[PDB]
Every structure is written in C-alpha cells, then in structure tokens.
C-alpha cells in the first residue's frame, strides 16, 4: 500500500503523468500556419497592452 | 613512523594559517567587488557599465546656409 502504490503515486508517477500530458498538449499542433499566425497576433496584442502600458 | 612518513605540527599549523588568510582575503574581496559593481551600475560614474553615447566629433561646425542653423 505504501511503497508500491502511494509513494510511487505521489512523487514519480504524478510527475510522469503531468509531464506526458503537457508534452502531448504542446507538441500536437495541426501544422498549419494560419493557426500559428493567429497565435502570433494574440501574443502581440497581449504584449502591447500589458508589459508596454506599465512603462 | 613519525620521522619517516610525517612532519611536526608546526608545518600543518602554519600552513593552515596561510590558507585561512588567503580564503578570508578572497571572501572580503568578493563582497567588495559585489558592492562596487552595484554602485557603478546604479550611478554610472565608474569605469564599468559605461554605455556608449554619440561622439561629438561627428558634428559639423560650419555655416549652415541659414544663420539660425
């Protein structure tokens, strides 16, 4: 219960699961430049109204 | 065994004092260098952190076809 299940679950298995989920989310892109440049526009708009306003 | 392989305690004692002096000097020098870096970056009056400005040798001091320059 403690070694083979819960101590495994908390530190290493949770870490592996979270990193795998984030890797799947980040990497799996459609490959289309339309979506990429839409993201670029969103990023530019955010930078201008956030970091820039507070000089 | 002591004569063939080892030395007296004076040698280790005085080597320890020499080493301690070197390390203490290095520590105070590191702290002083950090303080000097902070001061020069804050003020800009030191040799360090001197960002370039425009050279005044580029200015043309000649009559400019208009008296008011």
């Amino acid at each position: 219960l403690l070694d083979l299940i819960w101590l495994e679950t908390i530190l290493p298995k949770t870490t592996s699961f979270i990193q795998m989920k984030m890797s799947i989310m980040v990497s799996n892109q459609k490959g289309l430049i339309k979506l990429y440049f839409l993201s670029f526009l969103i990023t530019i708009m955010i930078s201008m109204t956030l970091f820039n306003y507070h000089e | 065994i002591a004569r063939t392989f080892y030395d007296g305690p004076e040698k280790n004692y005085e080597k320890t004092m020499a080493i301690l002096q070197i390390e203490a000097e290095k520590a105070e020098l590191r702290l002083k260098e950090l303080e000097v870096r902070r001061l020069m970056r804050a003020r800009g009056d030191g040799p360090w952190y001197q960002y370039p400005t425009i050279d005044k040798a580029l200015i043309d001091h000649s009559p400019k076809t208009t008296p008011d320059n």
């Binding site: - | 001197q50 960002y51 400005t53 580029l58 200015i59 076809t65 320059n69």
Partner: protein
Amino acid sequence: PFFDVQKRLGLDLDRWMTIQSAEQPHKIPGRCHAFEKEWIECAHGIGGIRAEK
C-alpha cells in the same frame, strides 16, 4: 555582438548618416540642429547612465 571594425580602421561606413548635425550636402541644416548639437556635446563622454539624468 558589436565588433567595432569601423572605429578600429577609421572607416566611416555608416556614421555619416546617424545624426542630423553631421555634414549634410550643401550645408543644409536640420530643423533641430542646434538642439541636437547641444544634447550631443553635453551628453558626450559621460556614459549612457549618467547622460539620461
């Protein structure tokens, strides 16, 4: 980063065009030539940090 080849060789590849107070053809002056020369002279040699204040 910045390799100052011009300063080393004394070449003037692009410095002629950087400021308004620098040898325009036919001695035609910029609109703010006097202000720019005053700023450059005051600014010169003290470094960027000191210069702003």
